[PDB]
Amino acid sequence: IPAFHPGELNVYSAPGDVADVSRALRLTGRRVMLVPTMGALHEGHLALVRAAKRVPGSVVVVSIFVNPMQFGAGGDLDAYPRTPDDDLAQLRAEGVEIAFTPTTAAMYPDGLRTTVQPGPLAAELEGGPRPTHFAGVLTVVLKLLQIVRPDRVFFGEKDYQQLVLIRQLVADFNLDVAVVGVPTVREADGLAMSSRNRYLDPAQRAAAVALSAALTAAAHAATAGAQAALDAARAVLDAAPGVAVDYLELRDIGLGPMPLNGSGRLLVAARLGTTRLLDNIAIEIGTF
Amino acid sequence: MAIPAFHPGELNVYSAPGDVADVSRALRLTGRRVMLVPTMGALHEGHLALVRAAKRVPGSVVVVSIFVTPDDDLAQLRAEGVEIAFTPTTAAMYPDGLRTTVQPGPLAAELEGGPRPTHFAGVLTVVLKLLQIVRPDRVFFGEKDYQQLVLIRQLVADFNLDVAVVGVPTVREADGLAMSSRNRYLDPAQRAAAVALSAALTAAAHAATAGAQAALDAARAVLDAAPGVAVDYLELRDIGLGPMPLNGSGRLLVAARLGTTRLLDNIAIEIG
Ligand SMILES: COc1ccc2c(c1)cc(C(=O)NS(=O)(=O)Cc1ccccc1)n2CC(=O)O
Ligand SMILES: COc1ccc2c(c1)cc(C(=O)NS(=O)(=O)Cc1ccccc1)n2CC(=O)O
Ligand SMILES: COc1ccc2c(c1)cc(C(=O)NS(=O)(=O)Cc1ccccc1)n2CC(=O)O
Numbered sequence: 257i258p259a260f261h262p263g264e265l266n267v268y269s270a271p272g273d274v275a276d277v278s279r280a281l282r283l284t285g286r287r288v289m290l291v292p293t294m295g296a297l298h299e300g301h302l303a304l305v306r307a308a309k310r311v312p313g314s315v316v317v318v319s320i321f322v323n324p325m326q327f328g329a330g331g332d333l334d335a336y337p338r339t340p341d342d343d344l345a346q347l348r349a350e351g352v353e354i355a356f357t358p359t360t361a362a363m364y365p366d367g368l369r370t371t372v373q374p375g376p377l378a379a380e381l382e383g384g385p386r387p388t389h390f391a392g393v394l395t396v397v398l399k400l401l402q403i404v405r406p407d408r409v410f411f412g413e414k415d416y417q418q419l420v421l422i423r424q425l426v427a428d429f430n431l432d433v434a435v436v437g438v439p440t441v442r443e444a445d446g447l448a449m450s451s452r453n454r455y456l457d458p459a460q461r462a463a464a465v466a467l468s469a470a471l472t473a474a475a476h477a478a479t480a481g482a483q484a485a486l487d488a489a490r491a492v493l494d495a496a497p498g499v500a501v502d503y504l505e506l507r508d509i510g511l512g513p514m515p516l517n518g519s520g521r522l523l524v525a526a527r528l529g530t531t532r533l534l535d536n537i538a539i540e541i542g543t544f
Numbered sequence: 545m546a547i548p549a550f551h552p553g554e555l556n557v558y559s560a561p562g563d564v565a566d567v568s569r570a571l572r573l574t575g576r577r578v579m580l581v582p583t584m585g586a587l588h589e590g591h592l593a594l595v596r597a598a599k600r601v602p603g604s605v606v607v608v609s610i611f612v613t614p615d616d617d618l619a620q621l622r623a624e625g626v627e628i629a630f631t632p633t634t635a636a637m638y639p640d641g642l643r644t645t646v647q648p649g650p651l652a653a654e655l656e657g658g659p660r661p662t663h664f665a666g667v668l669t670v671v672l673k674l675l676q677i678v679r680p681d682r683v684f685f686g687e688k689d690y691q692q693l694v695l696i697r698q699l700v701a702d703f704n705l706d707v708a709v710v711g712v713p714t715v716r717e718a719d720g721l722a723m724s725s726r727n728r729y730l731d732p733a734q735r736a737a738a739v740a741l742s743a744a745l746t747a748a749a750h751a752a753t754a755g756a757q758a759a760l761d762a763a764r765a766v767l768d769a770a771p772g773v774a775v776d777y778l779e780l781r782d783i784g785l786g787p788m789p790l791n792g793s794g795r796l797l798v799a800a801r802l803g804t805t806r807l808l809d810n811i812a813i814e815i816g
Contacts, residue, residue, distance in 0.1 A: 271704060369649035370668065370695075370702035375642075394644065402704040421644075428644035430561060430676040 265348045267355045271363070271403045274317065274356040278404050281315050289316045290406035292397060294323065296337040297346050300441040300449035304410040305350045307438050317354040317404050318347055324360060325368060326392030337451050356404065363399060371395045374421050375428075377511055381503065381523065382417055382534070393418060394425050401431055409433050414440040414448050416521060416536045420511050440535075442468065448535045459497070460528040466496030467524050470504075471537040474522050478539050482506055482516065485539060489522065500527045506539065518544060555622040557629045561637070561677045564630045568607065568678050576605040580680035580707075582671065584611040587620055590715045590723040594684040595624045597712050607678050611670075630678065637673065645669045648695055649702070651785055655691050655777060655797065656808070667692055668699050675707055682708040686715075688722055690795060690810040694785045714809075716742065722809045733772065734802045740770035741798055744778075745811040748796050756780060756788060756815050763796065774801040780813065791815045 257276040260266055268274040278288050289308035293301050301318075308316040320343055327333040340357070347355055371391055377383070378390035401409065411419045419437050426435050441449045446468030447461075456464055470492035477488035486506060493501050502525040508514050509521050523536040547570045548563045550556050558564045568578050579598035583591045591608075598606045608621055609630040621629055645665055651657070652664035675683065685693050693711050700709055715723045720742030721735075730738055744766035751762035760780060767775050776799040780788045788794045794813040799806060 275704075366698075366702065370699050371647045371649075373645045373647040373665075375644055391647070399702075399704050402706070405706075424640075424644050427640060430565075430673050432565070432676065432679075 260353075262353065263351075265344065265352055265355060267344070267357060269357055269359060269362065271356075271358055274354065275403050275405070277354065278317065278406070282405070282407075286313055286315045287311055287408070288404065288406045289314045290400065290404045290409045291316065291318045292400050292409065292411070293318060293320055293343075294336070294451070295320045295343050296339050296451040297343050298441075298449050298451065298453075300412050300414065302346060302350060303441045304412060304438050305347070305352060307436065308408070308410050309351065311408065315353050317356055317406065318352050319356040319358075319400055319404070321356075321358055321363065321396065321400075323363075323392060323396040325364075325371075325395055326389050328386065328389075337454065363396070372398055372425065375424055376513075377417070377421055377424070380511070381505065382525070390418070390421050394421060397422055398425060398429070398431075401426075401433055406433055408436050410436045410438055412440055412449075413437050413536070414450065415534065416523060417511060446472065448533075450533070452531055452533070455531040456528060460531065463497045463499055464528055464533060466493055466499050467526055467533055467535045471522055471524060471535055475537050475539055478541050480542075482520075482541055485522065485541070489524065493524070493526065498528060502526060502532065509538075516541065518542070550628075552627065554627065555618065555629060556627060557618065557631060559631050559633065559636065561630075561632055564607070564628065565677050565679075567628065568680075571605050572679070575603065577601055577603050577682070578678060578680040579604045579606045580674065580678045580683045581606060581608045581626075582674055582683070582685070583608060585725050587617040588723060588725060590686050590688060592620070592624065593715045594686065594712055595621070595626060597710065598682070598684050599625060601682065607680065609674050609678070630674075637670070646672055646699065649698055651691070651695060651698065654785075655779065656799065657691075659776075659806075664692065664695050668695060671696055672699060672703070672705075675705060680707055682710050684710045684712055686723075687711045687810070688714040688724065689808070690797060691785065720746065722807075724807070726805050726807065729805055730802065734805065737770045737773050738802055738807055740767055740773055741800060741807055741809040745796055745798060745809055749811050749813050752813050752815055756794075759796065759813060759815070763798070767798070767800070772802055776800055776806075783812075788815070 257280055258273045260277050282288055291304045291308055322336050372394040374390045374394050383390050423435050445465045447464055470489040473492050474485040474489035478485040493499055504524045506520050506522050508516050509519055518541055520539045521536055522539045525534045547566050550567045581594045581598050606626045607628040608626050646668040648664045648668055697709050719739045721738055744763040747766050748759040748763040752759040778798050780796050782788055783793050783795055795810055796813045797810040799808045
C-alpha cells in the first residue's frame with residue numbers, strides 16, 4: 257500500500273501498487289471506476305472520466321498503456337501517438353485521483369504466454385485482416401480488470417466491435433464488473449473523436465465529415481427499410497473526395513450470429529490517404 | 545438484494561453461480577477466508593486430502609465445486625465439515641455456449657498436450673470461471689496432474705489473479721500407485737504392472753545423487769522390467785516444466801498405456 261493523497265493525482269507504475277491502493281479504497285467504502293486508455297487523450301476520453309466521476313463516492317482510475325499485443329504489423333506500434341505530459345495535465349485538470357501507467361515489462365514479464373481467445377466475432381469486420389488484434393485487446397483488458405478490480409469500467413462506443421467483445425469477455429469469464437458504454441463524442445461537424453484524426457491533412461479533414469454524414473443520413477432513411485438506409489450512406493460516401501470505403505455494414509446490435517431485427521448498428525470503416533477512420537450509429541429499421 | 549440462505553456449520557449446496565458468488569462475498573465480508581477445492585467426476589481420496597488441507601487454514605470456509613451417487617459424495621463432504629458445495633449445470637456454466645476462452649501458452653502443446661491438444665484450454669477456461677465466481681483466497685489442486693497445476697499457476701500469474709495456488713502432494717495407494725479415477729478399471733495384471741510407474745520415479749529420485757543421467761536410466765530400467773507397459777514419455781524438466789537446469793530442483797514425469805488405460809505420475813527430483 258504506497259502513498260495515496262486524496263484530492264490530487266497519484267501516479268502508479270507498479271501493478272502491485274495500484275492493486276493495493278484500489279483494494280484499500282474499496283474496503284473503506286469508495287467505488288472504484290476504471291477508464292482504460294492508450295494515451296493521447298482527447299475530449300472523448302474526458303467524457304469517460306466525467307461519466308465515471310458522476311458515480312457517487314467514486315474514485316476514478318485511468319490507465320494509460322500502449323499495448324504491444326494488439327498491434328500488427330511492422331510500424332503500427334512505433335507510430336502510435338504518445339503524449340503523456342498532455343495526458344497527465346488533463347487528468348489532473350479533471351480531478352482524477354489515480355493514473356496507472358505500467359511499463360511493458362511489468363504487464364508482460366514472461367512475454368506472451370496465457371492469452372484470451374475471443375469468440376468468432378473477433379474474426380469479423382476489423383478482425384478480418386488482423387486475426388490476433390482482438391485477442392491482444394481482450395488479454396490486456398482482462399489483466400487491467402484483475403489488477404484494478406473496479407466496480408465499473410467505461411469505454412466509448414466509437415470502437416463498437418471492441419466494446420461488444422469486451423461485454424462477451426465480462427459475461428463469459430464471470431467478471432464481477434459493470435461495463436458502461438459512453439456515446440461517442442464528436443467534433444462540431446459530426447466527426448467522431450479519435451487519436452488518429454491528427455493524421456488527416458486539411459483536405460482529408462474536410463472529406464472525413466462524410467462518414468458521420470453517411471451514418472446520420474442512413475439513420476433517417478431507415479424508416480424506408482435497410483436497403484434504403486444503406487443506399488443513403490453509400491451515396492454520401494460516394495459523393496466524398498478520396499474516401500475509400502473498406503466496409504459498410506448493418507448488423508444486429510450484439511453484432512452476433514443473428515439476423516437484424518428492429519434495432520441494429522450501422523458500422524463504417526474508410527481510408528482517407530493512409531488514415532483509416534471508423535464510425536458507427538444506432539439504427540432503428542422501419543416502424544422502429 | 546437478499547443473500548441466499550447460508551447456514552454456518554452445515555453443508556450448503558448451490559447450483560446457481562450467482563448464488564455461490566453472493567454467499568462467498570457475504571462470507572469474505574464477515575471475516576472468513578474462502579478456500580476453493582475444484583473437483584470433477586465421482587469423489588476420490590485425492591479430492592479428500594485437498595479438502596483436509598483447505599480445512600486446516602484458520603477461519604476458512606471450504607467451497608467444493610463439483611462437475612457431475614451424487615448424494616453419497618455430498619454426505620462425504622458433510623462428514624469432512626465442508627460448508628459449501630457448488631454443483632452447477634453445464635447450461636449455468638455456459639449460458640451463451642462456448643465463446644470467449646483461455647488459450648494456454650506453449651506448455652500446453654507438450655507432454656499430455658500431444659495426445660489431447662485442446663484439453664488444457666478447457667481446463668484453464670473452467671478454472672478461470674470458477675475463480676471469478678467463487679473469488680477464493682486459496683485454490684487447491686493435486687500434484688498428480690502436474691502439467692495442469694503448472695498451467696494454472698501460469699494462468700494466475702499471466703492474468704494477475706489474486707488467489708494463492710496450493711499444490712497438495714499426491715495421495716498414493718500403499719504400494720505407491722498414484723490416486724486416479726482410472727485405477728478402478730485396471731485388471732489384476734495391469735494393477736500389478738502399474739506399480740512400475742511410481743517405483744521408477746522413486747528409484748530415480750534416489751539415484752539422483754549420481755546425476756541426471758543415472759536418475760533417468762534407473763527409471764527406464766524399472767519401466768523396462770514391467771510387461772504390458774507402453775511408455776509414452778519419460779521426461780526430466782525444471783519445476784516450471786522448462787528445460788532441466790544442470791543441477792538444482794526438477795520434476796520427472798512419466799505417462800504410459802497399460803491395455804486401454806493411460807496412467808501418469810510425477811515426482812520432485814534434486815540433481816546431485
Ligand atoms: C466518449 O467518446 C469517445 C470517443 C472516442 C473514443 C473514446 C471515447 C475512447 C476512445 C478510445 O480510444 N478508447 S481505447 O480504445 O483507447 C480504450 C481501451 C484501452 C485499452 C484497452 C482497450 C480499450 N476513442 C476512440 C479513439 O481515440 O480513436
Ligand atoms: C446468509 O449469508 C450469511 C453469510 C455469513 C454468515 C451468515 C449468513 C451467518 C453467519 C454467522 O456467523 N452466523 S453466527 O450466528 O454463527 C455468528 C455471528 C453472529 C453475529 C454476527 C456475526 C457472526 N455468517 C458468518 C460466518 O458464517 O462466518
Ligand atoms: C492430493 O492428492 C490427489 C491425488 C490425485 C488427484 C487429486 C489429488 C485431485 C485429482 C483430481 O482429479 N483433480 S480434478 O481433475 O478433479 C481438478 C479439477 C476440477 C475441475 C476442473 C479441472 C480440474 N486427482 C486425480 C487426478 O488428478 O487425475
